Amino acid sequence: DYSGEIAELYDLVHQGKGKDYHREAADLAALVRRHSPKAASLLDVACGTGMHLRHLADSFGTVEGLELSADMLAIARRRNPDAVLHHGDMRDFSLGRRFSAVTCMFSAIGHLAGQAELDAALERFAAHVLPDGVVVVEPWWFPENFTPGYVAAGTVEAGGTTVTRVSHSSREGEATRIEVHYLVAGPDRGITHHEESHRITLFTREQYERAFTAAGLSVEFMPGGPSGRGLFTGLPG
Amino acid sequence: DYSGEIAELYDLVHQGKGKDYHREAADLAALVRRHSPKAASLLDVACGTGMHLRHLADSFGTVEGLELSADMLAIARRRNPDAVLHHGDMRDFSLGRRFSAVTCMFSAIGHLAGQAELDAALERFAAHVLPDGVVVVEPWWFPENFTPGYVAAGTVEAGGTTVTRVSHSSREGEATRIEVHYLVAGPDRGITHHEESHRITLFTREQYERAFTAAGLSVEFMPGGPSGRGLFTGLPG
Ligand SMILES: Cc1cn([C@H]2C[C@H](O)[C@@H](COP(=O)(O)OP(=O)(O)Oc3ccccc3)O2)c(=O)[nH]c1=O
Numbered sequence: 001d002y003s004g005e006i007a008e009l010y011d012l013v014h015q016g017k018g019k020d021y022h023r024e025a026a027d028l029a030a031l032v033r034r035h036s037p038k039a040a041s042l043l044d045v046a047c048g049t050g051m052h053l054r055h056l057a058d059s060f061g062t063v064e065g066l067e068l069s070a071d072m073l074a075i076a077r078r079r080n081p082d083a084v085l086h087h088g089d090m091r092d093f094s095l096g097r098r099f100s101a102v103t104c105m106f107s108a109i110g111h112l113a114g115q116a117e118l119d120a121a122l123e124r125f126a127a128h129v130l131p132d133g134v135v136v137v138e139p140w141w142f143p144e145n146f147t148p149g150y151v152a153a154g155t156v157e158a159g160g161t162t163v164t165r166v167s168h169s170s171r172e173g174e175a176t177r178i179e180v181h182y183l184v185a186g187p188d189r190g191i192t193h194h195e196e197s198h199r200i201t202l203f204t205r206e207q208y209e210r211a212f213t214a215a216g217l218s219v220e221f222m223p224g225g226p227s228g229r230g231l232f233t234g235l236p237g
Numbered sequence: 238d239y240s241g242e243i244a245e246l247y248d249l250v251h252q253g254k255g256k257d258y259h260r261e262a263a264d265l266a267a268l269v270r271r272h273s274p275k276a277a278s279l280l281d282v283a284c285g286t287g288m289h290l291r292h293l294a295d296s297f298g299t300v301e302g303l304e305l306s307a308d309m310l311a312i313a314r315r316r317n318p319d320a321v322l323h324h325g326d327m328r329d330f331s332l333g334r335r336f337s338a339v340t341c342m343f344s345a346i347g348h349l350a351g352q353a354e355l356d357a358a359l360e361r362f363a364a365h366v367l368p369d370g371v372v373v374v375e376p377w378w379f380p381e382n383f384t385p386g387y388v389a390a391g392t393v394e395a396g397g398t399t400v401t402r403v404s405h406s407s408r409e410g411e412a413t414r415i416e417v418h419y420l421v422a423g424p425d426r427g428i429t430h431h432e433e434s435h436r437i438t439l440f441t442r443e444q445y446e447r448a449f450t451a452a453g454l455s456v457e458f459m460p461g462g463p464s465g466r467g468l469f470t471g472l473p474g
Pocket residue numbers: 141145146147148150152167169176178180198200228
């Protein structure tokens with residue numbers, strides 16, 4: 001879940017971590033146009049708080065989003081008041097139109113539980129992409145590149161609020177268990193503590209490739225990517 | 238209270254905050270010798286983890302400590318294995334000897350509850366100081382210099398452990414309420430959260446002066462001091 005204070009802190013936490021959604025969006029837009037020169041529309045699946053979408057809207061005449069968390073989607077709609085942002089589930093949704101690109105960024109795909117859900121999501125992405133368009137999926141880490149025991153800590157301040165965030169990652173079967181704690185402080189607020197836990201699936205490279213292929217997409221992996229985890233692209237046909 | 242993990246984290250937290258106990262001790266030793274040129278002994282009251290004492294031992298032939306927290310004192314004794322460190326209460330203790338200096342550092346005096354306890358502690362300090370010696374007390378903030386709403390945050394790493402500490406200070410009658418939260422993280426540890434709360438008395442400058450005078454000490458205040466809170470010195474007679 002991405003509800004409540006988690007959702008409210010998300011953008012500030014990733015700004016403090018230095019995530020550059022503007023540069024990621026410009027790179028994404030150029031990648032789409034590389035494959036589809038007259039591309040004019042984009043669907044961002046698991047769009048979160050709509051940071052990519054806000055920048056992509058400066059580049060594509062139609063951008064839409066899909067998000068399962070109502071609290072994340074509320075922030076996305078406020079950020080993107082002129083865009084249609086849909087509530088729904090990447091495993092099983094139907095918008096009744098296709099787009100030049102279908103994107104799923106920042107390892108959101110790792111919230112799927114196993115091969116059947118991964119295959120289902122990829123088939124939905126293929127069902128929403130145009131024939132000269134592109135499906136873009138930023139994976140979670142592969143098992144061979146996952147670092148168990150990893151601790152990340154950072155602090156950011158904005159508007160009078162100080163937020164400290166610490167994460168810890170461990171191996172739990174075929175998933176990463178990530179525990180995240182926050183201290184949120186301010187002159188009137190005092191200090192409040194928050195915590196959450198995620199299980200993010202460690203799909204192998206071959207499992208992603210299998211899901212793309214079963215959806216009718218030809219698949220390519222590029223290492224590095226916006227987060228060090230690489231990027232998969234898929235073209236219909 | 239200064240027990241358990243609080244005590245265990247104390248030195249790492251103040252090292253990350255940049256507290257320089259070596260420089261503070263050299264300054265203290267020179268201040269004592271300024272008043273008592275043949276000074277050879279020192280008692281550090283509320284000595285905590287014994288950081289000042291460890292450096293003062295390089296300068297005075299006899300250093301002793303007094304500390305009410307068994308967990309702080311355990312760390313102090315490990316740091317100072319050749320020194321006599323006493324368990325007891327600054328309000329009412331009796332060592333049966335006097336010292337060239339009696340010191341009480343880093344606002345430990347603010348854990349006393351009102352004028353009667355402050356007067357009692359100062360009388361005990363005078364009862365343990367030699368006639369050419371000096372009593373040194375680092376006060377808490379005076380009401381006029383206290384900053385309500387203050388938030389301090391910092392993170393330090395050592396040995397594989399990451400510690401984030403956040404404090405928040407507010408006014409609660411004639412005391413500061415300080416809330417402190419910690420996140421302690423490591424590759425095997427995971428993340429653990431700890432909290433504590435202190436009530437530190439906001440004695441006025443005149444209240445400190447009154448306690449010194451009632452103990453038979455002539456009192457001087459020097460602003461700035463090791464922590465921005467100044468320093469009181471008191472000479473018998
Ligand atoms: C260099 C490196 C890191 N990691 C893992 C270790 C850890 O799991 C993650 C880095 O931690 P954090 O910066 O908190 O990342 P996010 O907020 O993106 O993760 C979340 C994802 C989902 C929900 C919550 C948090 O990458 C690896 O597995 N391999 C690597 O080489």
